[PDB]
Structures are given as C-alpha cells and as structure tokens.
Design a protein around this ligand. Structure first.
Ligand SMILES: O=C(O)c1ccnc(C(=O)O)c1
Ligand SMILES: [Mn+2]
Length: 461
C-alpha cells in the first residue's frame, strides 16, 4: 500500500508548500491547513487501501497493551511498534518514515530524519492526555493517524488546540478536532504548540490511534516563565480559644498525640478521621453549599485547573475555619502531631510560616507537574468536605512522587472530614489527578452536589 496519491500530485503539493512557506491557510477537498493558533494540517483518507487499514487495525488490536499513567495522562500503549515484524505494521513504518517523511520534508523545507518514533494508543472511558507542548529535543512534527470507530464530539477524545497569552503560556481551547477513520493530523512542534486529548466519554467505544514524531534539528526554546511566589505568613496569635470549638476532643488529648507522632515519624504521613467536631463540619459544608462563596478558576492549563475562593468575601464560619488553620494554637498542635518545630514552645531565629487556600474540585479539574514545580521541606495539610461516596477511581486524589522517577510514594484520597498530613523533602513533588466523568455517579446519592471542596495548607519550619 501507499498513502494518498492525491497529495503527491505535483500542483497541489506546490500549493501546500506555498502555504507553509508563506504561513497562509489553505483549504482543499483532500487536505486542510490552518496557521492559528499554530500550524496544523488534516489529511482525511490518508491511506486509500481500505483492505490495508482493516488488516492494520486487526494487527494492533491483537497486540498486548499496558496501562500508562501519571499526572499528565491515563491510557493504554501497545508493545513497541519499532520492534514489530507483522506485515501491515512494518509497511506502515515505511510509508510514514520514508515516503510521507520526504513529502513533508519537501513542503515544510525541514531536513527531517528517518528516525522512527511512533506508537499505538488506546483511550477508553475516562482516559485523557492533558495540556502539553510535545517539547523534547529532536521533535519537529507531530502526527496522528486515527483508526477509530464512528466518532463524534459527545464521545470526547477530541484533539484540542490552545491559544496562548503574553507569557507564552496556554490560555484557552480555540480549535477542537474530531477523530475519524483513516484521518491523519499533523502539526509543528513549537514553544506554542499546546494541545490535549480531551477525556473519552464513551462508555463503550475505544479510541485507537497511531501517533509519533518526525525528528529534525534542535531549536532554542525561550527561557521558561516563572510565576510569582505565593505569599506566606506566620501564625495568627490566639485571641479566643479555637481548637476546643472546632477539633474532635480525641486529638486534643496528650496520650493520643504521642500515638500520632510515633506513627508520623515512621511514615511522614498520617490520616486523622472525624477531625472537626460533627456540628462544625456540618455547618462548614452547609456554608459551602448555601453561603454564596465566590469561586474563580485558576490556570494556566499546563499547570492547573481548579476553583479557589476569594477569602475576604467568605461567610464568617469559613473565615473562622481559615483562621483555625493559621492559628498559633494549631501550629503547636501540628508540632505535637509531627515532631516538627512550628511553634516556639515546641521541643527543639527562623519563623514558622504557612499558606492556605479553600478549593473546589469538580469534573475536569487537575494539577500537573511543570518545569517550575518546586520542591521544599514542607508539611502539607488537607481537610476534605462534601465528598461522601467519593471513589479513588473518580480521580481527585493527591499523589506524591519522587523527582524524576515513576516511583509513586503516596496517594491521599478524598475522605469526608479526614485531615491528611504529609511531610515532604526537596526530592518530592505532588499533583491532583484529573477528576473524570465517573464522578457523575456522585449524584446518585447526593444529587444536590457537584464534586467536593478542601482546605489546603502548607506549613514551613
Ligand atoms: O493520540 C492522539 O490523539 C495524540 C494527540 C496529540 N498528542 C499525543 C501525544 O502522545 O503527545 C497524542
Ligand atoms: Mn502531544
């Protein structure tokens, strides 16, 4: 087999070359090329032999697939295609990396290498690949061939293209391409080529694709942009006594704190159930639902996506709960839980500090590791609210990982009125995993509720 004789036709080929050269859009029945938000082209009916595609799909489905998972994605990848000796796959490598490569090199005027870089992916219900730019030394042009069943927008799995802002960071989705059988999409890898594969919503269908890169000369990325640091502050001096009013009395007994600390110094992590008094916890949840909390979406999409409350406008109960977590008394309680010096009367410049946010998590939200995700000695605190009947399979758990390793260290799951404490070192990073569409099952038991909320606080010695 071969690829579309149409696009190899010399006049059309020269029209394509002209549009790439001049960076101008070009529309044709057999090819469509757009320059915004960045250069991307679509060739439908990429391989004319329908017999070949059937045999190819048959070979791929008969491969073994392996779960792939981290902050950025969740899907399945096949045995390496570079190592396969089945005829249809072997033929595809040649078509792509010899025939089609030269055609691309000709229209793009890039000395593309013959280096084979291709793989087969399978996205099913809740699989997704979040905002990223494909950046990796050598990659110049990304391509995707789709071998999907009949597909539409409501099934998800669309390839979305992000616009960009004044700081070269993704802003919003401005193009959304729907996969279809024998459709080839390719685009230029650049500092601005931010894109994602939206969550697959089809509970029955499987989004099968072949994707990879043509390699070429390395360029220079501009220096990466650094967010301003989040302000930190020391404890709020106790005026009125606050622990007694808020915390389960179990945790204010000395005998129980030594137990807690013995366990904490062993694991550097602990979970404290029923942490707030029930009456307070119920009033906090009630205020989060009915109290006119003002939420705002946080970005950018290659770092985070979630809602954060404007603390100054909160209901008094939620203000008071934020105060609890900044309070001198709590700083000392956390010292007795952990063995860390977060108050000057704890057992033995520097001044302990903290930062805090009240967050709302729903379907679609996440955080990602990014080049500037910075590691520090620090104690994390999370109190979850409004997540009754929440399952880890829904996403939304916090995960800790050793830097530059797939060795996962710990996972904290949303649990109503559970206080999680985690001490990190400078070689530890964290993320909140994409909340997927299984989380809609939450409404079967609590219909007047969308996702969950948490108080997230970080303390430093
Ligand atoms: O398989 C895809 O649709 C796809 C699209 C964009 N990027 C990737 C990737 O693996 O980076 C995969
Ligand atoms: Mn990609």
């Amino acid at each position: 087999a071969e690829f579309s004789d149409a696009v190899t036709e010399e006049t059309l080929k020269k029209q394509v070359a002209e549009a790439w050269s001049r960076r101008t859009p070009f529309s044709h029945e057999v090819i469509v090329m757009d320059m915004d938000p960045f250069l991307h082209c679509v060739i439908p009916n990429f391989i004319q032999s329908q017999d070949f595609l059937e045999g190819l799909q048959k070979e791929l489905m008969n491969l073994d697939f392996h779960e792939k998972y981290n902050d950025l994605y969740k899907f399945q990848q096949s045995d390496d295609l570079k190592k396969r000796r089945e005829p249809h796959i072997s033929t595809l490598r040649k078509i792509l990396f010899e025939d089609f490569r030269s055609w691309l090199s000709d229209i793009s005027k890039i000395d593309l290498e013959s280096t084979i870089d291709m793989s087969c992916a399978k996205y099913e219900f809740t699989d997704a690949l979040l905002c990223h730019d494909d950046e990796l030394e050598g990659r110049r042009i990304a391509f995707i061939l789709y071998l999907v069943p009949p597909w539409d927008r409501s099934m998800g799995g669309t390839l979305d293209l992000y616009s960009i802002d004044e700081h070269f960071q993704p802003k919003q989705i401005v193009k959304s391409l729907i996969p279809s059988w024998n459709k080839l999409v390719f685009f230029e890898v650049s500092p601005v080529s931010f894109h994602q594969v939206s969550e697959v919503l089809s509970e029955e269908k499987s989004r099968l694709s072949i994707s990879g890169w043509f390699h070429g000369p390395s360029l220079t990325r501009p220096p990466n942009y650094f967010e301003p640091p989040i302000p930190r502050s020391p404890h709020i001096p106790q005026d009125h006594e606050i622990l007694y009013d808020w915390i389960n009395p179990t945790y204010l007994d000395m005998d129980y704190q030594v137990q807690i600390q013995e366990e904490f110094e062993e694991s550097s992590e602990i979970l404290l159930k029923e942490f707030l008094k029930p009456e307070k916890f119920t009033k906090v949840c009630e205020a989060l639902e009915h109290g006119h909390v003002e939420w705002s979406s946080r970005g950018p999409p290659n770092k985070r996506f979630y809602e954060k409350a404007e603390e100054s406008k909160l209901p008094e109960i939620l203000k008071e709960c934020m105060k609890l977590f900044r309070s001198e008394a709590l700083f000392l309680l956390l010292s007795n839980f952990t063995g860390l010096k977060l108050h000057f009367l704890a057992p033995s410049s520097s001044v302990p500090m903290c930062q805090g946010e009240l967050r709302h998590w729903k379907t679609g939200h996440y955080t990602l590791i990014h080049d500037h995700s910075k590691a520090e000695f620090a104690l994390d605190l999370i109190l979850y609210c409004g997540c009754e009947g929440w399952e880890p399979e829904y996403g939304g758990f916090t995960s800790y990982i050793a830097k530059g390793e797939d060795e996962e260290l710990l996972t904290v799951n949303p649990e109503s009125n559970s206080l999680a404490l985690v001490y990190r070192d400078r070689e530890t990073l964290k993320f909140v995993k994409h909340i997927n569409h299984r989380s809609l099952e939450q409404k079967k038991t609590f219909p007047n509720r969308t996702g969950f909320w948490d108080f997230s606080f970080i303390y430093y010695e």
